[PDB]
Amino acid sequence: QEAGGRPGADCEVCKEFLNRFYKSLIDRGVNFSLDTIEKELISFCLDTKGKENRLCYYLGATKDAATKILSEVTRPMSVHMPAMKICEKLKKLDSQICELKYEKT
């Protein structure tokens, strides 16, 4: 998972999720299928810690929460894309996505 330097996207939890999810699907060979990216969003979103399990409510997934924005993740996740800046695009959809910091402590 991950990448050296954590170049996920923008804020933090949003970036780590996108980046790790993104290169995971590409590496696992579990991509190029929008419906699959949707199902794996479900899988990955719930199979993580509260920060990410909660973060996904802002991004979609879980077959609930926000169903429209879900497609705006899966589609660019299907091809090597801006996904870092996509969290910046996400900022235009909601600003709260930029937070949820793992450990401010």
Swiss-Prot record:
Cysteines paired by S-S bonds: C11-C98, C14-C87, C45-C56
Record's note on what induces expression: Not induced by endoplasmic reticulum stress.
One GO biological process term: dopaminergic neuron differentiation
Keyword presence, Secreted: yes
Tissue: Widely expressed in neuronal and non-neuronal tissues. In the brain, highest levels in the optic nerve and corpus callosum.
Keywords of the record: Disulfide bond, Growth factor, Secreted, Signal
GO terms of molecular function: growth factor activity
Subcellular location: Secreted
Keyword Disulfide bond on entry: yes
GO cellular component: endoplasmic reticulum; extracellular space
UniProt function note: Trophic factor for dopamine neurons. Prevents the 6-hydroxydopamine (6-OHDA)-induced degeneration of dopaminergic neurons. When administered after 6-OHDA-lesioning, restores the dopaminergic function and prevents the degeneration of dopaminergic neurons in substantia nigra.
Family: Belongs to the ARMET family.
This protein's name: Cerebral dopamine neurotrophic factor
Portion of the full-length sequence here: 27 to 131 of 187
